[PDB]
């Protein structure tokens, strides 16, 4: 019904159905019990080249950074597609105007991507290529600017975000709250999105009480992480501009073009 029990369940099931990666799977690959052979460590150009050779095997006149940048974009386009299906399964979202749906996703998706990125990041680096690769934090810092400056903010954010020790049920509700935000610029039917968000945040508060009884201040810590994401995005949008202007072989994918247009 309008019941928060069926709201949480439907959101957790839409989360499991629609995202290829999640925290449980991430933790399993990083312990080395997912496959016969663990993720391929990418720490230098040597290993980055082995990795590209085996997992893609089509782009060797284009610079290393430009190729890595192409990959970031491919991953966003995929996750944007997963997020759109996830969104479509959120009670109430289907019944919105198409123009409101476009808005909520336009501004929602990068907050959601960076929030979920945290699940595949440890202090040392991150899982890539559907769980088959591990690119080191350091190797990324040791790229030529301005490309070495992309991920570092996301690791900073994820290190603190992961310390909250949330599980996938907690994260499902958190992504739902990011998408159903009543103050996106352009929103027509604000009052119906505010009521939708009020419900998700409410069941999120209730979910955190029962699931995380120790941490009594966890709910206000998560509301602040949503502000923090909104500002991680603006800084990243800005850094992607610098790259569009000052870099030739880095034409943005057309879907990400639309998303970034008129953004912030």
């Amino acid at each position: 019904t309008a019941d928060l029990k069926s709201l949480a369940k439907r959101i957790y099931e839409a989360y499991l159905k629609n995202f290829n990666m999640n925290k449980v799977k991430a933790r399993v690959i990083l312990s080395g019990k997912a496959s016969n052979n663990p993720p391929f460590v990418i720490h230098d150009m040597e290993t980055l080249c082995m990795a590209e050779k085996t997992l893609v095997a089509k782009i060797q006149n284009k610079e290393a950074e430009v190729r890595i940048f192409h990959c970031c974009q491919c991953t966003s386009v995929e996750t944007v597609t997963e997020l759109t299906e996830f969104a479509k399964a959120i009670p109430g979202f289907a019944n919105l105007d198409l123009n409101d749906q476009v808005t909520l996703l336009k501004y929602g998706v990068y907050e959601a991507i960076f929030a979920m990125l945290s699940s595949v990041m440890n202090k040392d680096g991150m899982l890539v290529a559907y769980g088959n690769g591990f690119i080191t934090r350091e190797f990324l810092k040791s790229l030529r600017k301005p490309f070495c400056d992309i991920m570092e903010p996301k690791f900073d954010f994820a290190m603190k975000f992961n310390a909250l020790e949330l599980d996938d049920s907690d994260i499902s509700l958190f992504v739902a709250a990011i998408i159903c935000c009543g103050d996106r610029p352009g929103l027509l039917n604000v009052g119906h999105i505010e009521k939708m968000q009020e419900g998700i945040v409410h069941v999120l508060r209730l979910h955190l009480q029962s699931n995380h009884p120790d941490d009594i201040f966890l709910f206000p810590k998560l509301l602040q992480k949503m502000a923090d994401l909104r500002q991680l995005v603006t800084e990243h949008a800005q850094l992607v501009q610098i790259i569009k202007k000052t870099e030739s072989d880095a034409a943005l994918h057309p879907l990400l073009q639309e998303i970034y247009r008129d953004m912030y």
Binding site: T84, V102, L105
Partner: peptide, 8 residues
């Protein structure tokens, strides 16, 4: 418009 399309 590519975003319209995904919500198909």
């Amino acid at each position: 418009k590519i975003l319209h399309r995904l919500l198909q």
